[PDB]
Amino acid sequence: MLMPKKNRIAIYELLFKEGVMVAKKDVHMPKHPELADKNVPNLHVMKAMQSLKSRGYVKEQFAWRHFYWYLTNEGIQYLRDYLHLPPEIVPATLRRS
Amino acid sequence: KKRKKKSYTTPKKNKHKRKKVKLAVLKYYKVDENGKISRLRRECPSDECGAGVFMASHFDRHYCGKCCLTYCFN
Amino acid sequence: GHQQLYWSHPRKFGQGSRSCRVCSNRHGLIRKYGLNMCRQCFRQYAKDIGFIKLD
Amino acid sequence: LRITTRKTPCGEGSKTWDRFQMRIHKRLIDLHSPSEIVKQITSISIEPGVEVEVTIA
Amino acid sequence: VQISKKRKFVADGIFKAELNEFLTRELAEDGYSGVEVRVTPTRTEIIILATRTQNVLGEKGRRIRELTAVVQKRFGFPE
Amino acid sequence: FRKFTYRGVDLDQLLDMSYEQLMQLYSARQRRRLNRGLRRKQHSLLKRLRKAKKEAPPMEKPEVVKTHLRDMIILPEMVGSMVGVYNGKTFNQVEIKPEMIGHYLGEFSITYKPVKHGRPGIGATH
RNA sequence: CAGCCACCCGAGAUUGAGCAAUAACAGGUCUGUGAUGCCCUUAGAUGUCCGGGGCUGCACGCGCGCUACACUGACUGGCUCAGCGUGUGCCUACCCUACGCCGGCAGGCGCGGGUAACCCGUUGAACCCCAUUCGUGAUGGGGAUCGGGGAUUGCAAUUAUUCCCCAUGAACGAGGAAUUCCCAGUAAGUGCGGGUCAUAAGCUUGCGUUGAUUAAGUCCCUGCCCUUUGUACACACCGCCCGU
RNA sequence: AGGAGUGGAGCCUGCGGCUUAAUUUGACUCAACACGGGAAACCUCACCCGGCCCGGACACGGACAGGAUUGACAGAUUGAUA
Ligand SMILES: [Mg+2]
Ligand SMILES: [Mg+2]
Ligand SMILES: [Zn+2]
Ligand SMILES: [Zn+2]
């Protein structure tokens, strides 16, 4: 989609921050609840996430009007390059244990 | 189930094609021979519309394009 | 502009403002007790919800 | 809680209805105790499915 | 605020149903059989019964953590 | 025969009256509608009607302005205006006459063709 | 014997539902679904918003129903009894209402309670009961149709959402051939709740309230089971098959 | 055996026919026809007349520091502050 660069950037920092992202399948709600205060429409989240899935960077699941996306290793590398993060920065899902 | 056959209502509305203009030379005017740039267009008086943005000059009125602020010639 | 027109019709009370929380359909919806599911989805999930047949 | 629905996913056939049911049972216990002893009694690994609410009058 | 007992029970049944459906769609390949929700003070334990527990957990637990986060994000439990 | 009169008051005072005074002459409904307020695109139609009336040459009818709105027939400000009301597929031409005050535009653009019956066929009587 | 009938004692001597086999139907549903395979379409789109129409349109035919044709009734006052239950919402706007005041009314304005055995509520239901006027006729039966006003919900009420008032006052005098459902707190009268619901029940799903006539049987009608019997059927009588 | 009926009236509703720009359509014996929880003003919505939008991922080539995105006014809307 045509979206502002800051919107895609914020979506990517969220996704890299916890490695997962959920979103209601509703193109008309004006603010993503997690991405509020940054003015990111839910439609932008869904379309950016589908772009990443098509490129093979996330895995998507759907159940009861909700998308769930999990970051893949190739997605982790791509997002690290895209946001320029230090190699030692890793998503929350890879931590603990 | 039949075809639209909507040839009665218009012959396909043309979409808009933006005319290609080369550069923003007409906005600034150094050419003072003494490196004195003169701005050939007004600038906007809005907060988020500082020195960078300018305002168009039609046959009348001044128009911003960013905040859509208009000052008629009068 | 399209920004002010897209989805501009008020949707606050009618059947166009309610839908199934499972399948997003708008027909045969059960609003009682806050279920907000259509009849068929309710028959599908009734045992999971806790509604069981006695009489 | 009662919900009566048509059995069919369509509108065909003899009109049969499912009569679903949920039953909520409610118990009240009043006791004279300090709050610490009440906390000791309440947290005794109660059986799952039972909601317990302790209120101070 | 607070809601009625009827609505609260219907709501937690709805939550259980949606959770079970999502877990089915996610872990059918790993022998998913059911989910048990245990509510304790300030904690909610979700027990997933599966034949292949290692596949459900994933390597170093990664998969399970993902699931937890997803639940955390979907049903709005406190972080 | 006699000059037009609406609820006892005639054309000129109807023009000279405000909306608050209109609500008294109007019936229940067309009073609720005015009290709730004429929204936009009703003022747009009113101002288009005003412009068409003003630009009209002397002794000649105003040009017909077309609209989708089943709107109030407001005080004679709309009387004499030539309006094409959309019926669903056509803009039917209607001239606003003083007796039409207090009515809806849709009352003058019928949305269906009146039925002229044909011979029964097929399983009319099983 | 299996059991059947009657009677005593007894709260009760058959409460009502739910679930329900083998096997089958080219029964219904792709219009419930992020259930679906194949086609079709996919940017002047069969995707999706947004105006306006429609879905109601009316010579006529056919189903389910509501209100009646009155006096075992209408009207007007008076009196006095329920049960099932639902109430403030993820998105989500929209709850149930006591009390005070204003207005015939429908309503309006202030104030509180209630997330409910806590408030509405002691749910002051209707029929029914008591008294009144009418007086056998389309009558004060009955309320279709239609006019003029007033409110409410909504973003818009016109093709009239709903409600109120005053007017208007149609057929209908118990219904032909032909048919439905019913065995006891039952049929039938009578209201009340839930669903639908911004606005809303002549529908449906439940609840009480008043409360019977008749029957305790039979294959006569209608089916549907068997059993014996016949078949040239076996895609099974919507079969098979003969001749010009 | 009977009870309440209805088939007759008026109205309300569903179905056919007729009509229509369109009157979206599924389901015609029991086993369709106050059924699709189907009481449609908008929405719903499928149908008809008009008009915006892409919410045409991604891969491969073009174009590109100007690819492309909004937009106030007047026209125009053969309805609109599209
Ligand atoms: Mg027989
Ligand atoms: Mg043979
Ligand atoms: Zn500016
Ligand atoms: Zn559903």
Q: How many CA atoms lie within 13 A of F55 on its CB side?
A: 10
Helix, strand, or coil here: B43?
strand
Judged by a CB distance cut-off of 8 A, whether residue A65 touches chain E is no
E56 chain-A contacts, CB cut-off 8 A? none
Helices A5-18 and A42-54: angle between axes, nearest 10 degrees:
70
Q: Which residue is nearest to nucleotide H20 (CA to C1')?
A: F113
Tell which CATH classification among 3.30.300.20, 1.20.1250.20, 3.40.50.300, 3.20.20.70 matches the domain E1-79: 3.30.300.20
Rounded Cα distance, E46 and B48, in Å: 51
Query: Residue C25 Cα, ligand 4 centroid: separation in angstroms?
Result: 6
Residues F48 and F70: beta-carbon distance below 8 Å: no
- Furthest CA-CA distance within chain C: 58
Query: Residue B67 Cα, ligand 2 centroid: separation in angstroms?
Result: 89
Tell which CATH classification among 3.30.365.10, 3.40.50.300, 4.10.830.10, 2.30.30.90 matches the domain C3-55: 4.10.830.10
Domain count of the fold of chain A: 1
The residue whose two tokens read 């499972």 is: C22
Resolution value (Å, 1 decimal)? 2.6
Give chain G positions with protein CB within 7 A.
16-19, 27-29, 31-35, 44-46, 49-55, 57-62, 85-94, 115-117, 148-159, 194-199, 204-206
What's the N-to-C CA distance of chain B in angstroms? 58
DSSP output for D8-51: SSSS-SS--EEEEE-------------HHHHHHHH-S-PPTT--
Judged by a CB distance cut-off of 8 A, whether residue A70 touches chain E is yes
Rounded Cα distance, B10 and B3, in Å: 16
Rounded Cα distance, F64 and F95, in Å: 9
Judged by CB atoms closer than 8 Å, whether chains meet at E6 and D24 is answered as yes
Name every residue whose Cβ is closer than 8 Å to that of residue E19 and which is 6 or more positions away in sequence. Answer: E35, E37, E46, E71, E75
Rounded Cα distance, A43 and A37, in Å: 16
Residue F83 β-bridge partners: F65, F94
Residues D7 and C41: beta-carbon distance below 8 Å: no
Q: Which of F46, F108, F102 is nearest to F72 (CA)?
A: F102
Q: Can you point out the beta strands (E) in F2-126?
A: 5-6, 9-10, 65-67, 82-86, 91-95
Element (H, E) at A60: strand A58-62
Amino acid at D10: C
For chain C, domain boundaries? 3-55
| CATH number reported for the structural domain that contains residue A44 in this entry | 1.10.10.10
Give chain H positions with protein CB within 7 A.
16-23, 26-27, 31-32, 35-38, 42-45, 48-59, 66-73, 77-82
* Segments forming the whole domain that contains residue A47: 3-97
Query: Residue B43 Cα, ligand 3 centroid: separation in angstroms?
Result: 8
The residues whose Cβ lies within 5 A of ligand 4, an ion, are C 20, 22-23, 38, 41
* Residue F58 CB in 7 A reach of strand H: no
State the Cα torsion D50-D53-E2-E7 to the nearest 10°. 20
Judged by CB atoms closer than 8 Å, whether chains meet at C34 and E9 is answered as no
**Bridge-based pairing state of the strands B62-63 and B70-71:** antiparallel
Judged by CB atoms closer than 8 Å, whether chains meet at A63 and E25 is answered as yes
The residue whose two tokens read 């409610």 is: D26
- Tell me the C-alpha to C-alpha distance, in Å, between residue B38 and each of B34, B41, B53: 11, 9, 15
Count of residues making up chain E: 79
Count of C-beta atoms within a 10 Å radius of residue A46: 19
